[PDB]
Each structure stands twice: as C-alpha cells, then as structure tokens.
Design a protein around this ligand. Structure first.
Ligand SMILES: [Cl-]
Ligand SMILES: [Zn+2]
Ligand SMILES: [Zn+2]
Length: 177
C-alpha cells in the first residue's frame, strides 16, 4: 500500500541520473492500474501504456497485464504464469529508448530496456513492442493494446485482423506479430 508514496516503478531508470525528481506511484501509474481495475482513465499513448505495464510487472498486477493485451489474445494468456514470473523477476528499472507513435495509421512501437538483477549482476531485456489502437464499441473513445508476440495463434492471413480493424490480418497486426 505504501508504494503509493515511493517512486513509481517506471520512473526507476539505472541509465539516468536526472535533475527532475522521479514521480511517485500515486502520481504516475497508479491511476491507470486502479482505473482499469474499477472501470474511463486510460493510457493516452503506447509509451504510456508500456510504462504502466512495466509497473504492473513490478507491483504484481497480472490482471492489468491481461486486460491491456489485445482482446483476441487475452484468453491465450495464463494469468498465474504471468503472476509468478512478475513476482520472481528481480526488477531493477526501465529505460525507454524510443517511441514511434505513428508506426501506421493504427499502430505504435516503443523500444525499451527492462532491467533486472541476477546472481551475475544488472541485466536488461532489450525489447521492441508493438501496440494497436482500438475504438470502444461504446463511444468514439479508443485505447491502446499490446500485441503479444509470444502467444501461439492459428490466424488466417487474408481474413479480417484480430484487432477488429476490418483490414486483412497480413496488412494490419500481422505486419508486426
Ligand atoms: Cl488461435
Ligand atoms: Zn509510472
Ligand atoms: Zn490489426
């Protein structure tokens, strides 16, 4: 509970000694985690979504990780396995290398390093993640969703994309996963 008043996990960056004080969890990712849990407050950009996901790994909020994954993939995730992996990894920070908000009409990328500690020392996962913007079936509002490249799927290439865009999978999310 008192993580609210400590540095937000996404604000811990071993690659930077900054002048500006890193934001507290309550002032950074917590509104987004709490929002999705109770509800609509949503990440405005793919970079912001990626940060909130990282903080959900560190703080062990696997529900948030599932619900911010492309809806068509969510039933393919194993929330218990996510929960365990999140808990057992000794997270040590986040460095956002680059944000590509206009990768396509409906996609964005975020390149980042997620740091962790091992017997051997400080290590990093260097990742390039892809996100898709999907409209609510509710109002003209849209949200960003993570395209999980690790889940096994048997998708038909010429059929409509799993994101619901109406574009062929191969001319849409299949370009990137
Ligand atoms: Cl499938
Ligand atoms: Zn944060
Ligand atoms: Zn798509």
């Amino acid at each position: 509970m008192l993580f609210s008043i400590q540095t937000c996990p996404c604000q811990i960056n071993p690659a930077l000694n900054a002048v500006s004080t890193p934001l507290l969890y309550q002032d950074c990712c917590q509104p987004y985690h709490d929002g999705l849990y109770n509800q609509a407050i949503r990440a405005d950009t793919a970079e912001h979504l990626m940060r909130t996901r990282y903080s959900a790994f560190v703080l062990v909020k696997p529900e948030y990780i599932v619900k911010t994954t492309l809806p068509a993939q969510q039933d393919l995730l194993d929330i218990k396995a996510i929960e365990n992996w999140a808990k057992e990894t000794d997270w040590a920070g986040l460095e956002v290398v680059a944000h590509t908000p206009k990768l396509s009409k409906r996609h964005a990328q975020v390149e980042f390093k997620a740091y962790f500690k091992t017997p051997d020392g400080l290590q990093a996962h260097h990742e390039l993640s892809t996100f898709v913007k999907i409209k609510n079936k509710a109002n003209s509002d849209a949200s960003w969703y993570f395209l999980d490249p690790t889940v096994s799927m048997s998708v038909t290439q010429k059929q409509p994309c799993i994101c619901g865009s109406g574009e062929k999978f191969k001319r849409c999310c299949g370009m990137y996963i």
